[PDB]
Amino acid sequence: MIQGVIQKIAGPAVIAKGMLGARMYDICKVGEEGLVGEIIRLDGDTAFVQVYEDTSGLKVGEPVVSTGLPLAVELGPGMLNGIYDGIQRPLERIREKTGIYITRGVVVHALDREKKWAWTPMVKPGDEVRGGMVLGTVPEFGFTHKILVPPDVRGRVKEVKPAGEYTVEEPVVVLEDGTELKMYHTWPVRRARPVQRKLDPNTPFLTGMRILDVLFPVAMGGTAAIPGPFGAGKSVTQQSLAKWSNADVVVYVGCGERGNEMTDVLVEFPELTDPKTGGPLMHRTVLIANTSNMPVAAREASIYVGVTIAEYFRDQGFSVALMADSTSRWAEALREISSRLEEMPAEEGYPPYLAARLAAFYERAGKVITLGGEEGAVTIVGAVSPPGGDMSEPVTQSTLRIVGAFWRLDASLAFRRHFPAINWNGSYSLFTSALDPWYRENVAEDYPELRDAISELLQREAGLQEIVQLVGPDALQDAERLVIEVGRIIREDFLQQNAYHEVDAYCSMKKAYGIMKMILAFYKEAEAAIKRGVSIDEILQLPVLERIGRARYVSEEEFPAYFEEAMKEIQGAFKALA
Amino acid sequence: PVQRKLDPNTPFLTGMRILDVLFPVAMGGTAAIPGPFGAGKSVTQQSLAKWSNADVVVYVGCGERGNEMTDVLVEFPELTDPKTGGPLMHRTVLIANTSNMPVAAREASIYVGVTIAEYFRDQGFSVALMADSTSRWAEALREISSRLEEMPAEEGYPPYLAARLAAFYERAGKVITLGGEEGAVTIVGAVSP
Amino acid sequence: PVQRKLDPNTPFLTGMRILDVLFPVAMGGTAAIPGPFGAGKSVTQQSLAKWSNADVVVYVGCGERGNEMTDVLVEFPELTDPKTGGPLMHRTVLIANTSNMPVAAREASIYVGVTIAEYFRDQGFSVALMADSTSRWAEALREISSRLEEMPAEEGYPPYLAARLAAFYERAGKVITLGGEEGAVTIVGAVSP
Amino acid sequence: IPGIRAQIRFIQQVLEQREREDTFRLKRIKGKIEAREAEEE
Amino acid sequence: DLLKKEYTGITYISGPLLFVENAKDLAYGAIVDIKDGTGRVRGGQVIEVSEEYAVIQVFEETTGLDLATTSVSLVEDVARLGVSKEMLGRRFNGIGKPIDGLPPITPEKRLPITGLPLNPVARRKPEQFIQTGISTIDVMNTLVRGQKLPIFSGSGLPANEIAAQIARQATVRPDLSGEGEKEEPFAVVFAAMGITQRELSYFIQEFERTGALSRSVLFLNKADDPTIERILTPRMALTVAEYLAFEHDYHVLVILTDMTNYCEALREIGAAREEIPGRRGYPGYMYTDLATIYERAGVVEGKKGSVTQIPILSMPDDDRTHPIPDLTGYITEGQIQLSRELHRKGIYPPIDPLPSLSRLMNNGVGKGKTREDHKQVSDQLYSAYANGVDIRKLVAIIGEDALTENDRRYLQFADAFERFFINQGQQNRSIEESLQIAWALLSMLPQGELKRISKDHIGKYYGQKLEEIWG
Amino acid sequence: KKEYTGITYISGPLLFVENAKDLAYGAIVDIKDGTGRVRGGQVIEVSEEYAVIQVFEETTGLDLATTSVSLVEDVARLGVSKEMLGRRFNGIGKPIDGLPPITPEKRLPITGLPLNPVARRKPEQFIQTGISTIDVMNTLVRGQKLPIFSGSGLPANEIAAQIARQATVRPDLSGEGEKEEPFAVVFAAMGITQRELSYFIQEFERTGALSRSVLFLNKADDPTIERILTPRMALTVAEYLAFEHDYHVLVILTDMTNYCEALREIGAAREEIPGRRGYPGYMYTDLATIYERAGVVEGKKGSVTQIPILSMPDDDRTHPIPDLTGYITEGQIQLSRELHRKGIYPPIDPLPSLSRLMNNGVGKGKTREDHKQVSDQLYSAYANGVDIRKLVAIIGEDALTENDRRYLQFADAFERFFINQGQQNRSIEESLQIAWALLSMLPQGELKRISKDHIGKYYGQKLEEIWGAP
Numbered sequence A: 001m002i003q004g005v006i007q008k009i010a011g012p013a014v015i016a017k018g019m020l021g022a023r024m025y026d027i028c029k030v031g032e033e034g035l036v037g038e039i040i041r042l043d044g045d046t047a048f049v050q051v052y053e054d055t056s057g058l059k060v061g062e063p064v065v066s067t068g069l070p071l072a073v074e075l076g077p078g079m080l081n082g083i084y085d086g087i088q089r090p091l092e093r094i095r096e097k098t099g100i101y102i103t104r105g106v107v108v109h110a111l112d113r114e115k116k117w118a119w120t121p122m123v124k125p126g127d128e129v130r131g132g133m134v135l136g137t138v139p140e141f142g143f144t145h146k147i148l149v150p151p152d153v154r155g156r157v158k159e160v161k162p163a164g165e166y167t168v169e170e171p172v173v174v175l176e177d178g179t180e181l182k183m184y185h186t187w188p189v190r191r192a193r194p195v196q197r198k199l200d201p202n203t204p205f206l207t208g209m210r211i212l213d214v215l216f217p218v219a220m221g222g223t224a225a226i227p228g229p230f231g232a233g234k235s236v237t238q239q240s241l242a243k244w245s246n247a248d249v250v251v252y253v254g255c256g257e258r259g260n261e262m263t264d265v266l267v268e269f270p271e272l273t274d275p276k277t278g279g280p281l282m283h284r285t286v287l288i289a290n291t292s293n294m295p296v297a298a299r300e301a302s303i304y305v306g307v308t309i310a311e312y313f314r315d316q317g318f319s320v321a322l323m324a325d326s327t328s329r330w331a332e333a334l335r336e337i338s339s340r341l342e343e344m345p346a347e348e349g350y351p352p353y354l355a356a357r358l359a360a361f362y363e364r365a366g367k368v369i370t371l372g373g374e375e376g377a378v379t380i381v382g383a384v385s386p387p388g389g390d391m392s393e394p395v396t397q398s399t400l401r402i403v404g405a406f407w408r409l410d411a412s413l414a415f416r417r418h419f420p421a422i423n424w425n426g427s428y429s430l431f432t433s434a435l436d437p438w439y440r441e442n443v444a445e446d447y448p449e450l451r452d453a454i455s456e457l458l459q460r461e462a463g464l465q466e467i468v469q470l471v472g473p474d475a476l477q478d479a480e481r482l483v484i485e486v487g488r489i490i491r492e493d494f495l496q497q498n499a500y501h502e503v504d505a506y507c508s509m510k511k512a513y514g515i516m517k518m519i520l521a522f523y524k525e526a527e528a529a530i531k532r533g534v535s536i537d538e539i540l541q542l543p544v545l546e547r548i549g550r551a552r553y554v555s556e557e558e559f560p561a562y563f564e565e566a567m568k569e570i571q572g573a574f575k576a577l578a
Numbered sequence B, C: 001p002v003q004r005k006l007d008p009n010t011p012f013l014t015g016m017r018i019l020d021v022l023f024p025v026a027m028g029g030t031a032a033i034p035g036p037f038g039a040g041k042s043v044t045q046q047s048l049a050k051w052s053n054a055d056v057v058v059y060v061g062c063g064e065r066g067n068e069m070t071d072v073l074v075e076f077p078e079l080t081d082p083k084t085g086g087p088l089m090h091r092t093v094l095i096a097n098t099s100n101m102p103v104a105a106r107e108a109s110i111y112v113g114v115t116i117a118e119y120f121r122d123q124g125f126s127v128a129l130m131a132d133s134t135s136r137w138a139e140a141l142r143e144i145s146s147r148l149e150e151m152p153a154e155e156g157y158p159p160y161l162a163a164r165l166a167a168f169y170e171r172a173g174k175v176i177t178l179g180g181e182e183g184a185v186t187i188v189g190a191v192s193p
Numbered sequence D: 001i002p003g004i005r006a007q008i009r010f011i012q013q014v015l016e017q018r019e020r021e022d023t024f025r026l027k028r029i030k031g032k033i034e035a036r037e038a039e040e041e
Numbered sequence E: 001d002l003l004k005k006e007y008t009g010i011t012y013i014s015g016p017l018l019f020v021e022n023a024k025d026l027a028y029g030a031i032v033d034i035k036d037g038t039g040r041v042r043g044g045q046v047i048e049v050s051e052e053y054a055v056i057q058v059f060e061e062t063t064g065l066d067l068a069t070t071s072v073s074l075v076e077d078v079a080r081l082g083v084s085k086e087m088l089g090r091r092f093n094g095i096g097k098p099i100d101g102l103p104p105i106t107p108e109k110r111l112p113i114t115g116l117p118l119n120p121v122a123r124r125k126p127e128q129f130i131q132t133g134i135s136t137i138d139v140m141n142t143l144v145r146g147q148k149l150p151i152f153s154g155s156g157l158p159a160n161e162i163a164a165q166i167a168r169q170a171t172v173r174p175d176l177s178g179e180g181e182k183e184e185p186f187a188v189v190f191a192a193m194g195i196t197q198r199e200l201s202y203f204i205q206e207f208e209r210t211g212a213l214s215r216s217v218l219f220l221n222k223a224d225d226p227t228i229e230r231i232l233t234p235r236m237a238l239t240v241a242e243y244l245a246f247e248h249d250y251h252v253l254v255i256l257t258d259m260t261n262y263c264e265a266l267r268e269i270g271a272a273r274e275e276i277p278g279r280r281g282y283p284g285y286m287y288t289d290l291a292t293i294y295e296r297a298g299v300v301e302g303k304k305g306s307v308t309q310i311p312i313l314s315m316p317d318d319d320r321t322h323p324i325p326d327l328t329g330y331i332t333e334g335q336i337q338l339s340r341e342l343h344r345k346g347i348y349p350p351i352d353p354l355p356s357l358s359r360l361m362n363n364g365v366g367k368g369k370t371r372e373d374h375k376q377v378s379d380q381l382y383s384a385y386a387n388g389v390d391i392r393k394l395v396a397i398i399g400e401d402a403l404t405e406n407d408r409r410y411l412q413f414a415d416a417f418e419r420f421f422i423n424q425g426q427q428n429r430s431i432e433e434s435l436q437i438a439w440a441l442l443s444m445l446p447q448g449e450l451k452r453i454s455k456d457h458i459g460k461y462y463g464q465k466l467e468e469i470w471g
Numbered sequence F: 001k002k003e004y005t006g007i008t009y010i011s012g013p014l015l016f017v018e019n020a021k022d023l024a025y026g027a028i029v030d031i032k033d034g035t036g037r038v039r040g041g042q043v044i045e046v047s048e049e050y051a052v053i054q055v056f057e058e059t060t061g062l063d064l065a066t067t068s069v070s071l072v073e074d075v076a077r078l079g080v081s082k083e084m085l086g087r088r089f090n091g092i093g094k095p096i097d098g099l100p101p102i103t104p105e106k107r108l109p110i111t112g113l114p115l116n117p118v119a120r121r122k123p124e125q126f127i128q129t130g131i132s133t134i135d136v137m138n139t140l141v142r143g144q145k146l147p148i149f150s151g152s153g154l155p156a157n158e159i160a161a162q163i164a165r166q167a168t169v170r171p172d173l174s175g176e177g178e179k180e181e182p183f184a185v186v187f188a189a190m191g192i193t194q195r196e197l198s199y200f201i202q203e204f205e206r207t208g209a210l211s212r213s214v215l216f217l218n219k220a221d222d223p224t225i226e227r228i229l230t231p232r233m234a235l236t237v238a239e240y241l242a243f244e245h246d247y248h249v250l251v252i253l254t255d256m257t258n259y260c261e262a263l264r265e266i267g268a269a270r271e272e273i274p275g276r277r278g279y280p281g282y283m284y285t286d287l288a289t290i291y292e293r294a295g296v297v298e299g300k301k302g303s304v305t306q307i308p309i310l311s312m313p314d315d316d317r318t319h320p321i322p323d324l325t326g327y328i329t330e331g332q333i334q335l336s337r338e339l340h341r342k343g344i345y346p347p348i349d350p351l352p353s354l355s356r357l358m359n360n361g362v363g364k365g366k367t368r369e370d371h372k373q374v375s376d377q378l379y380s381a382y383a384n385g386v387d388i389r390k391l392v393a394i395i396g397e398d399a400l401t402e403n404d405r406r407y408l409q410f411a412d413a414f415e416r417f418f419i420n421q422g423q424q425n426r427s428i429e430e431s432l433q434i435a436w437a438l439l440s441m442l443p444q445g446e447l448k449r450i451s452k453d454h455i456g457k458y459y460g461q462k463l464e465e466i467w468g469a470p
């Protein structure tokens, strides 16, 4: 092994000397405590090491040992219910080993080495196996966790363990030439896990929010970004997605965020239920927690560990949702490391390779045919926290250029307590066209036309607001003022969604379809009544407006009857009231 | 040093209605009067020097016109001290470093003025300290910092500008002097944004 | 060098009533013209080249578009000189640079053109110099300044942009040449904000 | 309209000043990179 | 351990920094003693160490130091503070030394002042509602036990008065939470950084009048004190707070008097080190540095005690987008923002609710905690006040007489809200008083326009008039 | 083959190799490590002491002990052939469609030589894009640089694909009848996602437009140096085809904003101090060296036409990228977000759009005698319709004059039928017929920009092309 000594210490940065032969981005043990660090520069006989832990108390002369391997994660059974740090250390074990505080230098296996798993082989001796093929199955929480061949392992099966209880260290399958395959393998977090081919985004990723699932949909394999100032509701939207998504597995990455939010997830989620499995929601969730007061160099590691775990679960045929709770924190960590490196910044202090790193991270998403032949997907939703809410900041601009959906939050709606507080004008989605056949087959044949009509009404309202802010709403004609009123009705009782209300927190596609149909039926009838001389102030007093407003609070089970009753009420009210 | 800092409970009467009524300053207080050129900072400072109830007035011409210092030197001997009735100039100490005087001396002039004011405070007097412009002192600090190749913080000023300003303005206050008497320093510092 | 600069007391006659009457330019004066897209700037420039009382016309294309430069290079060799019936190019020097040509050439284009104009002035001729876009030249100058890592002044332009423009425009004037003969250079420089 | 124009030009001047300060800092750090590489060799 | 080692050979002194060579055995982050030729000893910390030389930031001013006589000696390898329950009535400077004249504390433990990050698994969910007595806080921006709720202030705004009032009135309501037990009062840790004599005297006199000094630890860094001590001051204060809360079951309220001065000192140190700055020249690690301070508050599983932080920062030009308030809002659970327009109107406390926020409000309010209508009443108040503000902007164009009657009602609700719900003076309002005032205000609007409130709460509480509450 | 061992420094994208005085500046090298993997790199600085090499891919796994550097070519060169048509490349000319590498007729330096200004000639013939708002109002002329100014969510890729698979020349309108004049499309994609890559491949393959196209597709996670080299490769191929085989070449460059960001990042990596607005101070010259390679040459029958596509970052035309592009190119076609969100495709807004070379490529003997006047009348009438649409919201429908209501109807029908083309391929005659049908809604004699002859010859037809008889 490559061994050296510490030459300089400055914050998270340690320069070692005598490290000739050490490779770039290899993991090193720094100091007598063996703190984990990564080599980010080689210069003569020296190596620049960014330590993933606190460096306070280190002295010049302490040994630095290179392990000769880059950062890697253990991929196997045992991750589906746990919370990890940036470099994949279980926080439950760390708590049991240290207490209420996280102390540096703790060494603990990512996967519990004593937990027993019910192994069921799927292969027989003489079978030839390629990377990503299913060796067998193990149940975890009702999930059928598939033991995969490592992506770059090839050979013929020589011996296979029979069905029984084994630990992840047990070599369940031994190939010819003596290569042993355990229940887990290690993968470098910076390498994208190989696949066969990327597939077109056919099916949607149902987030459970009306505005996101209707006006700005994201596909099952797509990417989305949700930037906004502090208090706009990024994390509440992320947690709503984690609670209500239709993804099989949710990987939540709290990169440089509040620890109280990780605690909220840890406490609330075991009580909630998985909509599809029926079991606890925490059983389908993997948490990678790197709080803001944890070491800065570990934020990049946190992002990469999360995305690698998401890729691994995709390789088993699952639909994975990856919520990165902030990428601006990762960018700030990169800027801090670059400042320690004394490198010339690109723009606003960030290193030039920030855009390349972001693009590499976001390109890992997609619906794919896995190496084993089965079909899985990864959906990445990345939150961005621009400094001061300045959307012209380089991270937000770099994210604009690689994401298919953009959910822009504005502090104006958050101040009003109008939530989800999505800026409709500043948001967009590039998946609306490709998802239309699925909408026609699964929601309604006329759903795309209804959605387009709603968007056109919002556009007309936006155009008329230019005049409303000029001469007041009373200076408009009855048709234009009707458009304004229908726009505010849409905004208040279709786009609003209370993430804490027991009914309004979730909304199926058919409920949103019914609400849109009700609103547009009311709009058509109101315009017809306007053309026959009825006043708009007379229209605004109809109790069917109250029914439309209360529609969103109606439960999913009883919604169809409410919708039929309200459509009948719309027709009757605008027949009687002319 | 002083024995104790007291709470300021008496007004610094400037003789100007708006300041003495709507925005009063106490005897040991501090006041800033920023404004663009021609807004009347120096006229207010000289009105305070002529008409205020301070036992001793210390006027610091930090980097401003020499004609203003000459105007003070000529007019004050003819005016009357509002407290004792003697000539106004016997109440006054002038520290002048005009704009075309050496730039590094502005910072020294500010400290000389505040130290003289504190010395007169130690004798039991109430002292009004007028700084004609602290922006010139800040500019002198910026020039010296640039000669030091220090990294500028904001608009070229050194990062410790706020520290210097705070340490300067913190010297004012109503105190029990080391001798057991009661004295105060009032600082009115003009700013030229 | 010249023997003496003369007074702007004789007119440069463009042959266009509005310019010759309401907004005249003296022989050896300087004028600026904005270039809106459809405003017929090229026709006006051709009219100045064709009908003005200048003996020699020097036309400088600083950083023009490829097709816009091609327009000039194709259509001047078609203009007939009213004073001789022959081609107008027989008394015209054309400097042509496109945007993709080296930045040093685009920066030196106006200096080359005005030096040629001064050389023809030294022979007693009256020279009309037309700079097709000084904004493109300023862009080239800004790029060169950026390559030298100089401080950007306003909008990235080097702090000496005004000095360079003044040094270019002051070369115009009606003079007594070193040969004792009267000559002049009139500069009409187009700007494109 | 004139007030909005004045606000626009004020914001433009502030942004340009911040950009100028950033360029000055970049020049300083490039010079220090070159110098600290030159003397250390 | 207890033998002395001294490093002469200082090679560079400028600003706050000091270079000493051949000091390869000084640990990173170690506290050192700088002795000059007169015998005076200054404090310092190692911020970069290599086999060539070590970089030391000097806490005090560098006047009188010289390369020929100055000596640097190691104190301890890790910056630690001696803590005990004995210091509950004591005053300390920015570096933890007593300034009250009493003898030094006899420490039970010596804890690293930087602390350690709390394990998210070991944290609890902050849930216990704290009644501050201020309606715009209790009703709309509820403060819960274990929260970081900074006050975003301005130069002339009375943030110190609001902090003193909160410290005076803050109490839990176990009867509403069903616990129904007597509760010990809050222990207060007061960290002042660059505080002026006026604000310091105000705080001292308020704590004396309310009798809270006997249970308050004070770390005072004056405006004329050296500015590099402001880096240590909040870390020492929070070390004491964490020790008390999580080892003696104290409920600690921590007030950081001005974080703008802390960020100023951080910027000075970073610029002296030529750190690659963020916006407005502040160092790029400012987010992490502020996080290492803020994230030390909270509640821990299996522990009785708690740490509640109420930092105070003055936005320079009332600019919410300034780096200091921006990063603070990105770290903390919401903020209380003061309004200069409300202050000029004579409304106290000048808290405008729209830019304010409490992220943990949902945890502490609702049925079985405060009352069933709390959340919906808060939402309706926010919506109605936003409508009133929009109608004010409209009136600024079309004039009041051109309004409809509903817009007129919203305008009247807005100004009545400002003058009655916000403007309360120094009185201590129970949550029930604030809720009935809110319902009296909501009764000004038509019943059918309370769209965010369920019909049950409307039927139960709508109708009362403000004049029925007070004559 | 000489192997340059002696790596003395690795950090970020750069590595220093000593005793490399024989490496020419700008050369491309192969970086080999202990695992036998080979990476690409470019020499960005060479001196007596060491050579600085910028690595294409990530520098992970490299070490100063086992890393070796060897030269592959002293000048960035691309092997071009006529068998490139129907092929796809990864942005540095390596096939990614699974077909064997082409046999290079000749190898050309991708840093092309600037065209001699005296060798150029005026653009005089147009390209039929099949889109009415471009063909009629913003005509694309063979040899023009006509960028498309897009937005964040606008469908610029769809419009690019539609133009690519619809663009054709119309020699029959010039009276030549010479279908022997070949046409090719060079499509360069920069910084695109896998979604966009799949979309482009599917669009080019489903219609058979691939057979006359060359695709240089650079993905978003590909090396940024490949992004910088992609337009160079595309323009080298375009110049070769046009000026050595008389092809009429249309070059589509999406997206130039990605190219500018890559240029910014590479400049920052080489420690260059940025210029105005944080972009390199030489961005104008680089964009010029890209754009000015289009044109028509005297004595040669080929042509290069460029349609750069760039997303304005915040829909701001003052941003450096669109600003410099406007400085260099001849006009712009601006997509409209309000048209897009109303359901109109393609969302091209005629009012801010402009083709500066249009008046040279339209008229008698080129398109038709009435083209210019019809375009002018359409522009004026649409502007009137739009402002009357704004006014009717406050003053009401009946308060307007009868001709004002006619302008309202004209603007509505214009947006409905002329702009809202869909995926139709409209010949210039179809577009002119639709324009005349729309102008027939206005009273005769209100068409003031049009001569009475054209009015008599064409006025009177009614809207049947799109509705009632598609």
Ligand SMILES: Nc1ncnc2c1ncn2[C@@H]1O[C@H](COP(=O)(O)OP(=O)(O)OP(O)(O)=S)[C@@H](O)[C@H]1O
Pocket (backbone or CB within 6 Å): B035, B036, B037, B038, B039, B040, B041, B042, B043, B044, B064
């Ligand atoms: N209170 C006042 N009464 C009468 N005249 C006044 C008063 N204040 C200002 N002026 C007039 O306005 C002029 C401006 O004087 P100052 O206020 O002293 O200027 P300033 O504030 O010092 O700004 P400068 O010119 O940059 S030093 C004076 O010379 C008077 O003519």
Ligand SMILES: Nc1ncnc2c1ncn2[C@@H]1O[C@H](COP(=O)(O)OP(=O)(O)OP(O)(O)=S)[C@@H](O)[C@H]1O
Pocket (backbone or CB within 6 Å): C035, C036, C037, C038, C039, C040, C041, C042, C043, C044, C068
């Ligand atoms: N004085 C004029 N008399 C007659 N026609 C003119 C005149 N000025 C311009 N034109 C017309 O304008 C066209 C030629 O000039 P333009 O193309 O408008 O010049 P230009 O486009 O402004 O040049 P630029 O801005 O450098 S591209 C022809 O249609 C001319 O008939």
Ligand SMILES: Nc1ncnc2c1ncn2[C@@H]1O[C@H](COP(=O)(O)OP(=O)(O)O)[C@@H](O)[C@H]1O
Pocket (backbone or CB within 6 Å): A228, A229, A230, A231, A232, A233, A234, A235, A236, A237, A419, A420, A497, A498, A499, A500, E358, E359, E360, E362
């Ligand atoms: N969809 C929502 N429904 C209800 N309340 C919300 C919603 N989104 C945000 N909020 C409220 O706004 C606060 C701020 O949201 P949060 O996500 O914590 O800020 P950020 O944008 O930084 O993540 C939340 O604590 C919650 O009280």
Ligand SMILES: [Mg+2]
Pocket (backbone or CB within 6 Å): A234, A235, A236, A257, A325
């Ligand atoms: Mg968040």
Ligand SMILES: [Mg+2]
Pocket (backbone or CB within 6 Å): B041, B042, B064, B132
């Ligand atoms: Mg003055």
